[PDB]
Design a protein around this ligand. Structure first.
Ligand SMILES: O=[N+]([O-])c1ccc(O[C@@H]2O[C@H](CO)[C@@H](O[C@@H]3O[C@H](CO)[C@H](O)[C@H](O)[C@H]3O)[C@H](O)[C@H]2O)cc1
Ligand SMILES: OC[C@H]1O[C@@H](O[C@H]2[C@H](O)[C@@H](O)[C@H](O)O[C@@H]2CO)[C@H](O)[C@@H](O)[C@H]1O
Ligand SMILES: *[C@@H]1O[C@H](CO)[C@@H](O)[C@H](O)[C@H]1NC(C)=O
Ligand SMILES: [Co+2]
Ligand SMILES: [Co+2]
Length: 434
């Protein structure tokens, strides 16, 4: 797609800290940009939509190439359309925003310049942020994560994409998402099927795969940390069901691991660690700090800080595994105890380290789940299981929770706030900000 300018594009500024081994931190100035899927897509020479509801224009978009030639992405009114605001080092995303139309959530990338994404090399480093999940009920996911996206949003590889990172192009993740309207500088109208339960979305013939570090997927009830490897590390197109991922026939039939090696303390047995109020170790009614450390072995370490008290990731015992480091032994024990082989089939933490060795883009989002109602995060899943099934219970939410239309109607003012991002060598991000 190209870019149009019927609507100006002004990326909300966002600062973050780059810390160094010598003990100091230096303020960085970036901005956030919304993913292309949320934008108005229209004809280059008029205001006629190329996409509306969950249908492509059959005249403007008879095939993927013609559609991309005929159509452009336009600018975003971040606050008034999308409920996205920033202030200094803080980013807030509202759940439902009513303007001329209804908007649900957002997916945002951290920029280096107004035309390029910020890349981070996670291996050897740590990432810290503060979050307020107090206004996230059952069924919602305020997510902070990394994906192996190109810094230019795909432009250098696909010159029919002239919109680029400035307009939030080039997304990929470990679900090999097929809901994307543009992939690799062409539309995704070929094979498009509207979603049965979402008036605004569908599934096309192409998807976009890459490695994904899910640092944080959470609401006020549950949280999870999940690396997802792929057989090809970086962004790559996939074809149809061959994509695998959540929305293909066989989620396991593609090049990415859609499940991951997940660590949810509640799922692992500690039902008192994270939740709303003073009966939990971490009180999700209050802001908390989350630190994630990528040691060079390929293992992942985690600690939390709230009100000046520090907690390592709680210990878990699972099969022959015991500890609090997300390592090969944990991931292996998890497959043995809970079931499945997706993570190991895609090459495990060894394959994952090939991603964290290179650059990844920071993503912050807020979403509800039109596939599984977020039950995999915060409830019992599958819903016919009981606590006697290892790993079935992931949080205290009812198995009836998280129906998108219901939570959108009941909790439209839900929101997440991410703030105080700090990045640098392991051991550095707790030092004084600059
Ligand atoms: O315990 N404290 O509260 C405490 C201890 C040490 C300390 O040191 C000062 O830290 C600040 C912030 O990290 C340093 O400033 C930064 O230095 C950077 C050096 O590359 C760069 O110039 C940054 O822009 C600047 O903010 C400062 O030099 C330390 O003395 C502060 C508080
Ligand atoms: O449902 C989408 C969700 O799946 C996660 O994976 C689940 C998987 O669905 C389930 O069958 C298994 O028992 O538990 C896995 C871990 O919760 C992914 O972690 C997540 O990315 C979503 O894609
Ligand atoms: C949960 O984790 C906290 C923090 O490590 C610990 O103090 C507490 O004993 C754990 N509780 C259970 C039930 O595992
Ligand atoms: Co094709
Ligand atoms: Co270690």
């Amino acid at each position: 797609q190209s870019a149009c300018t019927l609507q100006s594009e002004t990326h909300p500024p966002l600062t973050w800290q780059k810390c160094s081994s010598g003990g100091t931190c230096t303020q960085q100035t970036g901005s956030v940009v919304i993913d292309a899927n949320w934008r108005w897509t229209h004809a280059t020479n008029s205001s006629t939509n190329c996409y509306d509801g969950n249908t492509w224009s059959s005249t403007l978009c008879p095939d993927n190439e013609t559609c991309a030639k005929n159509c452009c992405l336009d600018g975003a009114a971040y606050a008034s359309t999308y409920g996205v605001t920033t202030s200094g080092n803080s980013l807030s995303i509202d759940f439902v925003t009513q303007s001329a139309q209804k908007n649900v959530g957002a997916r945002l990338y951290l920029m280096a310049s107004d035309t390029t994404y910020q890349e981070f090399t996670l291996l050897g480093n740590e990432f810290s942020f503060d979050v307020d999940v107090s206004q996230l009920p059952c069924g919602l996911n305020g997510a902070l994560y990394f994906v192996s996206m190109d810094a230019d949003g795909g432009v250098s590889k696909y010159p029919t994409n002239t919109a680029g990172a400035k307009y939030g192009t080039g997304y990929c993740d470990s679900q090999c998402p097929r809901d994307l309207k543009f992939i690799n500088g062409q539309a995704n109208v070929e094979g498009w099927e509207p979603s049965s339960n979402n008036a605004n979305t569908g599934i096309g013939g192409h998807g976009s795969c890459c490695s994904q570090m899910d640092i944080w997927e959470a609401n006020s009830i549950s949280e999870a940390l999940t690396p997802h490897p792929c057989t090809t590390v970086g962004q790559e197109i996939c074809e149809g069901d061959g994509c695998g991922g959540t929305y293909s026939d066989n989620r396991y039939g593609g090049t990415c691991d859609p499940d991951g090696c997940d660590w949810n303390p509640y799922r692992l047995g500690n039902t008192s660690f994270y939740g709303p109020g003073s009966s939990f170790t971490l009180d999700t009614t209050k802001k908390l700090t989350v630190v994630t450390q990528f040691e060079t072995s390929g293992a992942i370490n985690r600690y939390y800080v709230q009100n000046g008290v520090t907690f390592q990731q709680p210990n878990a015992e699972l099969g022959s595994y015991s500890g609090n480091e997300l390592n090969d032994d944990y991931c292996t024990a998890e497959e043995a105890e809970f079931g499945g082989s997706s993570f190991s089939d895609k090459g495990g933490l060894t394959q994952f380290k090939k991603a964290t060795s290179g650059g990844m883009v920071l993503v912050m989002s807020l979403w509800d789940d039109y596939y599984a109602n977020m039950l995999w995060l915060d409830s019992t899943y599958p819903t016919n299981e009981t606590s006697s099934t290892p790993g079935a219970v992931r949080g205290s939410c009812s198995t009836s929770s998280g129906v998108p239309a219901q939570v959108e109607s009941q909790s439209p003012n839900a929101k997440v706030t991410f703030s105080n991002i700090k990045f640098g060598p392991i051991g550095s991000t707790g030092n004084p900000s600059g």
